[PDB]
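Retro notes
What went well: the complex prediction finally ran end to end.
Inputs used:
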Amino acid sequence: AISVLEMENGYWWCRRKKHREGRLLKVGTRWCFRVEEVNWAAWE
Amino acid sequence: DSLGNTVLHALVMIADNSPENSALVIHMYDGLLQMGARLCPTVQLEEISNHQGLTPLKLAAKEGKIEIFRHILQREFSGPYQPLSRKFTEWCYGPVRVSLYDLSSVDSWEKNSVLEIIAFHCKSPNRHRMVVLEPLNKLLQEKWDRLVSRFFFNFACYLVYMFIFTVVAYHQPSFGESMLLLGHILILLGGIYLLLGQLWYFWRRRLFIWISFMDSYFEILFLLQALLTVLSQVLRFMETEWYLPLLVLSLVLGWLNLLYYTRGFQHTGIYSVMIQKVILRDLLRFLLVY
Amino acid sequence: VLSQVLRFMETEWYLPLLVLSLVLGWLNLLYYTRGFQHTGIYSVMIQKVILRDLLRFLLVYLVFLFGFAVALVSLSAPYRSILDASLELFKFTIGMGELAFQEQLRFRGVVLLLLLAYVLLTYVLLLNMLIALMSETVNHVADNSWSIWKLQK
Amino acid sequence: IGMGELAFQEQLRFRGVVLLLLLAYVLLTYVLLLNMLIALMSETVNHVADNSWSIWKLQK
Amino acid sequence: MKAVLNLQDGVNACIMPLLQIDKDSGNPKPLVNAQCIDEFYQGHSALHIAIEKRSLQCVKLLVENGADVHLRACGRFFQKHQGTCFYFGELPLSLAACTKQWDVVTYLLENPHQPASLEATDSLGNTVLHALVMIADNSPENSALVIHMYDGLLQMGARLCPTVQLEEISNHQGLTPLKLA
């Protein structure tokens, strides 16, 4: 994670842009990140 | 509050990882949030700034409180209190439980995010326990799988630079002359580049973690190696007699620096922490002996 | 095979590869033994022993002493390819030492900083990546050793 | 021991008669030594319990 | 497709005007079955949607005068493009078996309107037993489900068609359920 943040910052000579994760999926009257979960033991 | 806190901040600070008071903390937090919604629904209680510019979530991340932090990170509710939630299940298919998490903890277009606070500004021993929660874990995996190419490209560039350094500095007299001159030019340029990059790194990361000693010694080693490299290279120009040994020190130090690019790239990472720990014992080691 | 067929040409380069083959062969002898009868448990250990123990050869000994070879090459023709300073290494780290003050040499550092950092760092690294081996071997033993031994059988 | 007889040897091919001794021999020796240490470690943390008292009584 | 997601099954009982007049009158294409060919919700049809919910009457009505049972769910020719990341076998019978629908699979196997072959293959080459194998996992909870459905399907296949060896059915990679497991 520390390395990922450091490279995400970018080089000194060039300033790299950013790439936001997720899209504005509104769930009501909001940036979100989806994940697919599988858990047999969760439900019984 | 005189310190800048509020009710939720105070609930965060007095919290602890013990389970006796965890039920108290989460129950009172949820109750206060619901009552605040009912009385004054026009105010964002979660988005209240401390005197250090922190929120209850950021404060919980910084102070090392994990149980309250996890609950705040995955808050669902039901009924009239739907908008006061951060985890929305779209549809359920037995075990298939596709869900959506909210991202107020993303570094991108958010200065002073939760990820930075966990990585840099956190001092707790639980900092490695807070990067396995589902939203942070999946976000980190998705972000790391994108930039492996840059990591390996930098690895290859460093490897070829070290090969050139070894070959050029090897055949020291103590059109071969042109080849050695060009090699020395390349080595001095690379040393200058490494010095400037490391200097920018330390200038940007001024506040450290505590003093930036137990976690960022590889950058110090890189700075030292390039510093001795440029020092010996510029001292050889004057034909001063100190250049010859120190130069190869740089060289040997470089072959230690190559261990950083490896040892942590894929299914190989659990080598480094022990090497970080072995330097701890030197506190009295040097003193008591000799 | 390459060394023997090169020896036919009466070239100075046949000797290394040949003897290299020899040492490699005495490594290959470890396969027939150590996994023949009630002895695969001792084989498996940490990562088939040798697979995890090779981190001393290709990390801190071969590619690392390449650096000290370059050093003693540049720590003054005999200095031609690699042959000049290999014997210097071989007689300096675990041999004798003779280096005094000469015309523009500064022996202070070659034998006072280089020879006094090499052995130190090597010992420090081998101790901690021995700590590693015991830490990984306190676990993993479990009972899976019997299963993996049966698998290789 | 590895000391003393390691100087310049007259008329030897110096490319493969010396890049195998410190490169492989000490590697193998320390590897075997640490393997035996690991074995002792294995029969040390486990298979120890408190049976040493019983074995001492058996010897007595 | 969008009229089944509701509950109480209070709409399917009155879809007869949609069924007749529209059908058998200049529609060589699928009658009402269609295929829903797109990226999101790739493939699928009315039968799969009906099997999705714990409903049997709608399944009966659909199969009485509707689509064939041998209709692939994902379909298409690109296996890397599917509407959902759950792999069940791409068949209504496979979907019913994988979801522990005893009554649904019982009705599907024997019904005098459109029998379903227990040996029907899949676009990838799998069958019902292969599908049970792939969706299986080492967790104890679903292991019992998979093993019991496997035994029940094997017994039903022996009772219905004892002249075919279900176990010795090769995949597209030349594998059997035992070899695949």
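What we learned: The interface with chain B takes residues 84-86, 99 of chain E (CB under 8 Å).
What to try next: split runs per interface for comparison.
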